[PDB]
Protein backbone atom coordinates (compact mmCIF):
# COMPACT_ATOMS: atom_id res chain seq x y z
CA UNK A 1 0.00 0.00 0.00
CA UNK A 2 1.28 3.41 1.08
CA UNK A 3 3.06 3.87 4.40
CA UNK A 4 3.86 7.46 5.21
CA UNK A 5 0.63 8.51 6.95
CA UNK A 6 2.07 6.71 9.99
CA UNK A 7 -0.55 6.69 12.74
CA UNK A 8 0.90 5.92 16.17
CA UNK A 9 -0.39 5.99 19.75
CA UNK A 10 2.32 5.73 22.40
CA UNK A 11 1.98 5.93 26.19
CA UNK A 12 5.19 7.76 27.11
CA UNK A 13 5.13 7.55 30.89
CA UNK A 14 2.07 9.46 32.03
CA UNK A 15 1.39 11.26 28.72
CA UNK A 16 -0.54 9.45 26.03
CA UNK A 17 0.90 10.82 22.80
CA UNK A 18 -1.17 10.41 19.65
CA UNK A 19 0.70 11.14 16.47
CA UNK A 20 0.46 11.36 12.70
CA UNK A 21 3.79 11.12 10.87
CA UNK A 22 4.67 12.55 7.48
CA UNK A 23 8.16 13.07 6.04
CA UNK A 24 8.69 16.40 7.78
CA UNK A 25 5.31 17.39 9.24
CA UNK A 26 3.92 15.73 12.35
CA UNK A 27 0.83 16.16 14.50
CA UNK A 28 0.88 15.42 18.22
CA UNK A 29 -2.33 15.37 20.25
CA UNK A 30 -0.84 14.91 23.72
CA UNK A 31 -3.09 13.98 26.68
CA UNK A 32 -1.64 14.47 30.17
CA UNK A 33 -3.23 11.64 32.10
CA UNK A 34 -2.36 13.16 35.48
CA UNK A 35 -4.65 16.16 34.88
CA UNK A 36 -7.58 14.54 33.01
CA UNK A 37 -10.66 14.40 35.27
CA UNK A 38 -12.86 12.04 33.28
CA UNK A 39 -15.39 14.66 32.10
CA UNK A 40 -16.63 14.12 28.58
CA UNK A 41 -16.50 17.80 27.54
CA UNK A 42 -13.85 16.53 25.10
CA UNK A 43 -16.03 13.76 23.68
CA UNK A 44 -19.13 15.89 23.43
CA UNK A 45 -17.17 18.60 21.64
CA UNK A 46 -15.03 16.56 19.19
CA UNK A 47 -16.27 17.70 15.79
CA UNK A 48 -15.02 14.43 14.23
CA UNK A 49 -16.34 12.03 16.96
CA UNK A 50 -13.07 10.34 17.83
CA UNK A 51 -12.60 10.89 21.57
CA UNK A 52 -14.37 8.26 23.70
CA UNK A 53 -14.38 8.00 27.48
CA UNK A 54 -12.95 5.05 29.37
CA UNK A 55 -12.76 3.66 32.91
CA UNK A 56 -12.99 7.02 34.65
CA UNK A 57 -13.22 5.76 38.21
CA UNK A 58 -10.53 3.12 37.91
CA UNK A 59 -8.06 5.37 36.10
CA UNK A 60 -8.71 8.31 38.42
CA UNK A 61 -8.12 5.99 41.38
CA UNK A 62 -4.97 4.38 40.01
CA UNK A 63 -6.32 0.84 39.68
CA UNK A 64 -6.08 0.78 35.86
CA UNK A 65 -2.78 0.69 33.98
CA UNK A 66 -3.40 -0.21 30.32
CA UNK A 67 -5.69 2.73 29.60
CA UNK A 68 -6.23 6.44 30.08
CA UNK A 69 -9.42 8.26 31.03
CA UNK A 70 -10.14 8.86 27.32
CA UNK A 71 -9.35 6.96 24.10
CA UNK A 72 -8.75 9.02 20.93
CA UNK A 73 -8.95 7.29 17.53
CA UNK A 74 -5.98 9.09 16.01
CA UNK A 75 -6.95 7.80 12.56
CA UNK A 76 -10.21 9.76 12.80
CA UNK A 77 -8.88 12.83 14.66
CA UNK A 78 -8.30 15.86 12.34
CA UNK A 79 -5.99 17.80 14.67
CA UNK A 80 -8.34 20.83 14.72
CA UNK A 81 -7.61 21.39 18.39
CA UNK A 82 -11.25 22.03 19.38
CA UNK A 83 -10.77 19.52 22.28
CA UNK A 84 -7.71 21.52 23.52
CA UNK A 85 -9.70 24.85 23.55
CA UNK A 86 -12.89 23.32 25.11
CA UNK A 87 -11.30 21.18 27.94
CA UNK A 88 -11.92 22.99 31.23
CA UNK A 89 -8.72 21.70 33.00
CA UNK A 90 -6.06 21.87 30.25
CA UNK A 91 -5.06 18.22 30.08
CA UNK A 92 -4.96 18.07 26.27
CA UNK A 93 -2.34 19.91 24.09
CA UNK A 94 -1.72 20.04 20.35
CA UNK A 95 1.82 20.23 19.02
CA UNK A 96 2.06 20.60 15.26
CA UNK A 97 5.78 20.29 14.55
CA UNK A 98 7.37 20.49 17.98
CA UNK A 99 5.60 23.48 19.49
CA UNK A 100 2.23 23.99 21.14
CA UNK A 101 0.46 25.61 18.21
CA UNK A 102 -3.28 26.18 17.71
CA UNK A 103 -4.00 27.27 14.13
CA UNK A 104 -7.71 27.73 14.75
CA UNK A 105 -6.98 30.35 17.42
CA UNK A 106 -4.22 31.84 15.28
CA UNK A 107 -6.92 32.50 12.68
CA UNK A 108 -9.56 33.32 15.35
CA UNK A 109 -11.94 30.62 14.15
CA UNK A 110 -13.11 29.53 17.59
CA UNK A 111 -14.02 31.22 20.88
CA UNK A 112 -12.28 30.32 24.11
CA UNK A 113 -13.54 29.92 27.70
CA UNK A 114 -13.69 33.11 29.83
CA UNK A 115 -12.50 31.74 33.22
CA UNK A 116 -11.87 35.46 33.96
CA UNK A 117 -9.43 34.97 36.87
CA UNK A 118 -7.80 37.89 38.76
CA UNK A 119 -6.50 38.73 42.29
CA UNK A 120 -6.57 42.45 43.18
CA UNK A 121 -3.11 42.74 44.69
CA UNK A 122 -4.21 45.86 46.56
CA UNK A 123 -6.61 43.71 48.58
CA UNK A 124 -4.95 40.24 48.85
CA UNK A 125 -2.90 39.90 52.11
CA UNK A 126 -0.64 36.86 51.32
CA UNK A 127 -3.00 34.66 53.41
CA UNK A 128 -2.40 30.92 52.38
CA UNK A 129 -6.18 30.03 52.32
CA UNK A 130 -6.51 30.28 48.52
CA UNK A 131 -3.56 27.91 47.86
CA UNK A 132 -4.82 25.58 50.62
CA UNK A 133 -8.48 25.24 49.42
CA UNK A 134 -7.62 25.01 45.69
CA UNK A 135 -8.76 21.58 44.48
CA UNK A 136 -6.31 21.77 41.50
CA UNK A 137 -2.73 23.12 41.75
CA UNK A 138 -3.53 26.48 40.18
CA UNK A 139 -2.59 29.17 42.70
CA UNK A 140 0.96 30.47 42.07
CA UNK A 141 1.66 32.54 45.17
CA UNK A 142 5.11 34.14 45.03
CA UNK A 143 5.86 35.13 48.62
CA UNK A 144 9.10 35.13 50.63
CA UNK A 145 8.91 32.36 53.22
CA UNK A 146 9.23 33.72 56.75
CA UNK A 147 10.21 31.78 59.88
CA UNK A 148 7.10 29.66 59.48
CA UNK A 149 8.34 26.33 58.06
CA UNK A 150 11.66 27.79 56.84
CA UNK A 151 14.47 30.27 57.39
CA UNK A 152 13.25 33.87 57.34
CA UNK A 153 12.22 35.32 54.01
CA UNK A 154 13.22 38.67 55.40
CA UNK A 155 12.72 38.25 59.18
CA UNK A 156 9.75 37.75 61.50
CA UNK A 157 10.06 41.40 62.27
CA UNK A 158 10.36 42.41 58.63
CA UNK A 159 7.18 40.61 57.67
CA UNK A 160 5.68 43.81 59.11
CA UNK A 161 7.06 47.16 57.96
CA UNK A 162 8.06 48.44 61.39
CA UNK A 163 10.28 51.43 62.20
CA UNK A 164 12.70 50.30 64.92
CA UNK A 165 6.95 52.54 67.40
CA UNK A 166 4.05 51.73 65.10
CA UNK A 167 3.38 49.78 61.93
CA UNK A 168 3.57 51.84 58.77
CA UNK A 169 0.25 51.06 57.14
CA UNK A 170 0.40 47.86 55.15
CA UNK A 171 2.82 45.08 54.38
CA UNK A 172 1.74 42.90 51.43
CA UNK A 173 5.15 41.38 50.71
CA UNK A 174 5.26 39.49 47.44
CA UNK A 175 2.68 38.73 44.77
CA UNK A 176 -0.09 36.07 44.27
CA UNK A 177 -1.71 35.08 40.92
CA UNK A 178 -3.94 32.26 39.48
CA UNK A 179 -2.56 30.11 36.63
CA UNK A 180 -5.42 30.86 34.28
CA UNK A 181 -4.94 27.72 32.22
CA UNK A 182 -5.37 25.50 35.30
CA UNK A 183 -8.25 27.11 37.30
CA UNK A 184 -11.51 25.15 36.70
CA UNK A 185 -13.77 27.94 38.12
CA UNK A 186 -14.77 25.87 41.25
CA UNK A 187 -14.73 29.07 43.34
CA UNK A 188 -13.41 27.46 46.53
CA UNK A 189 -10.85 30.29 46.62
CA UNK A 190 -13.31 33.14 45.93
CA UNK A 191 -15.99 31.87 48.36
CA UNK A 192 -13.34 31.38 51.11
CA UNK A 193 -10.97 34.30 50.43
CA UNK A 194 -10.71 36.49 53.49
CA UNK A 195 -10.65 39.88 51.63
CA UNK A 196 -12.90 39.14 48.59
CA UNK A 197 -9.97 39.87 46.28
CA UNK A 198 -10.47 36.95 43.84
CA UNK A 199 -12.72 37.31 40.73
CA UNK A 200 -13.51 33.99 39.00
CA UNK A 201 -16.76 33.21 37.11
CA UNK A 202 -17.97 29.70 36.41
CA UNK A 203 -17.66 28.65 32.80
CA UNK A 204 -20.88 26.60 32.90
CA UNK A 205 -24.30 27.32 34.35
CA UNK A 206 -27.12 24.93 35.08
CA UNK A 207 -28.17 22.55 37.82
CA UNK A 208 -27.11 19.15 39.12
CA UNK A 209 -29.30 17.04 41.39
CA UNK A 210 -28.50 14.01 43.54
CA UNK A 211 -31.20 11.44 44.30
CA UNK A 212 -29.53 10.18 47.46
CA UNK A 213 -32.07 7.37 47.86
CA UNK A 214 -30.63 5.60 44.85
CA UNK A 215 -26.96 5.42 45.77
CA UNK A 216 -25.94 1.86 46.66
CA UNK A 217 -23.80 2.93 49.57
CA UNK A 218 -20.13 2.02 49.36
CA UNK A 219 -19.40 3.52 45.96
CA UNK A 220 -17.62 6.77 46.62
CA UNK A 221 -16.43 6.91 43.02
CA UNK A 222 -18.23 10.20 42.44
CA UNK A 223 -16.53 11.63 45.53
CA UNK A 224 -13.17 10.30 44.36
CA UNK A 225 -13.40 11.69 40.82
CA UNK A 226 -15.03 15.09 41.38
CA UNK A 227 -12.39 17.65 40.33
CA UNK A 228 -13.80 20.53 42.35
CA UNK A 229 -14.54 18.35 45.43
CA UNK A 230 -18.13 19.50 45.46
CA UNK A 231 -19.37 16.05 46.47
CA UNK A 232 -19.30 14.78 50.04
CA UNK A 233 -20.50 11.81 52.03
CA UNK A 234 -22.80 13.48 54.57
CA UNK A 235 -21.26 12.72 57.94
CA UNK A 236 -23.33 10.32 60.06
CA UNK A 237 -24.79 12.04 63.09
CA UNK A 238 -23.91 10.80 66.57
CA UNK A 239 -26.40 9.03 68.76
CA UNK A 240 -28.75 11.23 70.84
CA UNK A 241 -28.70 13.53 67.80
CA UNK A 242 -30.12 11.42 64.96
CA UNK A 243 -33.71 12.51 65.73
CA UNK A 244 -35.29 9.76 63.67
CA UNK A 245 -33.70 10.99 60.44
CA UNK A 246 -31.12 8.38 59.59
CA UNK A 247 -28.71 9.97 57.07
CA UNK A 248 -28.23 10.73 53.39
CA UNK A 249 -25.84 8.63 51.36
CA UNK A 250 -24.50 11.32 49.00
CA UNK A 251 -24.95 15.01 48.26
CA UNK A 252 -23.37 17.89 46.35
CA UNK A 253 -22.42 21.52 46.89
CA UNK A 254 -23.86 23.55 44.03
CA UNK A 255 -21.57 26.41 45.04
CA UNK A 256 -18.53 24.42 43.95
CA UNK A 257 -19.83 22.07 41.28
CA UNK A 258 -18.50 23.29 37.93
CA UNK A 259 -20.92 21.17 35.87
CA UNK A 260 -18.03 19.17 34.45
CA UNK A 261 -19.62 15.72 34.20
CA UNK A 262 -17.03 13.40 35.74
CA UNK A 263 -19.53 12.40 38.42
CA UNK A 264 -22.04 11.29 35.79
CA UNK A 265 -19.40 9.51 33.74
CA UNK A 266 -18.12 7.65 36.81
CA UNK A 267 -21.27 6.68 38.73
CA UNK A 268 -22.12 2.96 38.23
CA UNK A 269 -25.70 3.62 39.43
CA UNK A 270 -28.79 4.11 37.28
CA UNK A 271 -29.98 7.70 37.63
CA UNK A 272 -28.58 9.06 40.88
CA UNK A 273 -27.18 12.12 39.11
CA UNK A 274 -28.88 14.60 36.77
CA UNK A 275 -26.63 17.00 34.86
CA UNK A 276 -27.76 19.83 32.61
CA UNK A 277 -25.70 22.84 31.55
CA UNK A 278 -27.49 25.98 30.36
CA UNK A 279 -24.86 28.53 29.34
CA UNK A 280 -21.14 28.45 28.59
CA UNK A 281 -19.29 31.74 29.09
CA UNK A 282 -16.87 32.63 26.30
CA UNK A 283 -14.76 35.37 24.79
CA UNK A 284 -14.44 35.46 21.06
CA UNK A 285 -17.49 35.96 18.98
CA UNK A 286 -19.16 32.74 17.79
CA UNK A 287 -19.38 30.20 14.96
CA UNK A 288 -21.89 27.79 13.47
CA UNK A 289 -19.58 25.08 14.79
CA UNK A 290 -19.79 26.68 18.22
CA UNK A 291 -23.59 26.71 18.07
CA UNK A 292 -23.48 23.00 17.25
CA UNK A 293 -21.11 22.45 20.17
CA UNK A 294 -23.41 24.39 22.50
CA UNK A 295 -26.30 22.20 21.39
CA UNK A 296 -24.20 19.11 22.08
CA UNK A 297 -23.03 20.23 25.52
CA UNK A 298 -26.46 21.38 26.66
CA UNK A 299 -28.40 18.11 26.41
CA UNK A 300 -29.33 16.71 29.84
CA UNK A 301 -27.76 13.42 30.83
CA UNK A 302 -27.71 10.85 33.61
CA UNK A 303 -26.09 7.52 34.41
CA UNK A 304 -27.14 4.17 32.97
CA UNK A 305 -26.72 0.51 33.83
CA UNK A 306 -26.60 -2.15 31.11
CA UNK A 307 -25.61 -0.13 28.07
CA UNK A 308 -25.19 -1.85 24.72
CA UNK A 309 -22.46 -4.49 24.25
CA UNK A 310 -21.41 -3.46 20.74
CA UNK A 311 -19.62 -0.44 22.24
CA UNK A 312 -18.01 -2.36 25.12
CA UNK A 313 -14.93 -0.53 26.35
CA UNK A 314 -16.48 2.94 26.63
CA UNK A 315 -19.29 4.84 28.35
CA UNK A 316 -22.83 5.59 27.16
CA UNK A 317 -25.18 7.80 29.17
CA UNK A 318 -28.94 8.23 29.17
CA UNK A 319 -30.59 10.92 27.10
CA UNK A 320 -33.14 12.68 29.31
CA UNK A 321 -36.08 14.18 27.45
Amino acid sequence: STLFPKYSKTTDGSKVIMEQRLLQQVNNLILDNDICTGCGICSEVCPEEAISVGAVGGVRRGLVDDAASIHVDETKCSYCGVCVIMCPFSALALKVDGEERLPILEKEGFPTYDKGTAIDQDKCVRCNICDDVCPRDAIDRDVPLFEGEDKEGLAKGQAVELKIRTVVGQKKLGNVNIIDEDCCTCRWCAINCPTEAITVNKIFEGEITFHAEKCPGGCSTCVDVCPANAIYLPTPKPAKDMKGQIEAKIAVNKDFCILCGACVNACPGEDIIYLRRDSVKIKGKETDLFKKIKEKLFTPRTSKVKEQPSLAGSVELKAVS
Binding site: V125, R126, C127, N128, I129, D132, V133, L145, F146, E147, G148, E149, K156, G157, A159, V160, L162, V167, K171, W188, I191, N192, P194, T195, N229, A230, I231, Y232, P234, T235, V252, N253, D255, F256
Partner: protein, 65 residues
Protein backbone atom coordinates in the same frame (compact mmCIF):
# COMPACT_ATOMS: atom_id res chain seq x y z
CA UNK B 1 -0.66 36.29 77.89
CA UNK B 2 -1.75 35.12 74.46
CA UNK B 3 -5.38 35.00 73.35
CA UNK B 4 -7.02 34.71 69.90
CA UNK B 5 -10.63 35.79 69.14
CA UNK B 6 -12.07 32.85 67.16
CA UNK B 7 -15.07 35.13 66.65
CA UNK B 8 -13.01 37.38 64.30
CA UNK B 9 -10.41 34.96 62.84
CA UNK B 10 -10.51 33.71 59.25
CA UNK B 11 -7.80 31.08 59.80
CA UNK B 12 -5.41 33.03 57.50
CA UNK B 13 -1.91 31.58 57.85
CA UNK B 14 -0.38 35.14 58.02
CA UNK B 15 -0.29 34.77 61.81
CA UNK B 16 1.23 31.40 62.00
CA UNK B 17 3.72 31.97 59.20
CA UNK B 18 5.58 34.61 61.23
CA UNK B 19 6.21 33.29 64.73
CA UNK B 20 7.46 29.77 65.40
CA UNK B 21 5.04 29.62 68.31
CA UNK B 22 1.83 29.95 66.26
CA UNK B 23 1.00 26.75 64.41
CA UNK B 24 -2.33 26.99 62.47
CA UNK B 25 -3.91 23.61 61.68
CA UNK B 26 -6.54 23.64 58.94
CA UNK B 27 -8.55 20.49 59.47
CA UNK B 28 -9.44 18.96 56.12
CA UNK B 29 -11.61 21.00 53.77
CA UNK B 30 -14.95 19.38 53.06
CA UNK B 31 -17.90 20.75 51.08
CA UNK B 32 -20.03 19.78 54.10
CA UNK B 33 -19.45 23.18 55.62
CA UNK B 34 -17.93 24.72 52.52
CA UNK B 35 -15.75 26.88 54.74
CA UNK B 36 -12.25 26.98 56.17
CA UNK B 37 -12.07 26.09 59.85
CA UNK B 38 -9.15 25.14 62.03
CA UNK B 39 -7.35 26.19 65.18
CA UNK B 40 -4.51 28.47 66.28
CA UNK B 41 -2.11 26.87 68.76
CA UNK B 42 0.40 29.08 70.68
CA UNK B 43 3.33 27.60 72.67
CA UNK B 44 5.13 29.46 75.44
CA UNK B 45 8.50 27.91 74.62
CA UNK B 46 8.93 30.18 71.59
CA UNK B 47 7.19 33.49 72.25
CA UNK B 48 8.46 36.99 73.03
CA UNK B 49 6.63 40.28 73.64
CA UNK B 50 7.31 41.06 69.95
CA UNK B 51 3.60 41.60 69.27
CA UNK B 52 4.34 41.78 65.53
CA UNK B 53 1.71 39.14 64.84
CA UNK B 54 -0.93 41.22 66.56
CA UNK B 55 -0.98 43.66 63.64
CA UNK B 56 0.19 41.18 61.05
CA UNK B 57 -3.16 39.45 61.40
CA UNK B 58 -5.45 40.98 58.75
CA UNK B 59 -8.19 41.09 61.43
CA UNK B 60 -7.63 42.26 64.99
CA UNK B 61 -8.09 38.70 66.18
CA UNK B 62 -4.94 38.59 68.36
CA UNK B 63 -4.19 40.33 71.63
CA UNK B 64 -0.98 39.39 73.45
CA UNK B 65 0.78 40.51 76.65
Amino acid sequence: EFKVDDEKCTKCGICGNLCEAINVLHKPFSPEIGKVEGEVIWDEAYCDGCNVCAEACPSEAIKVT
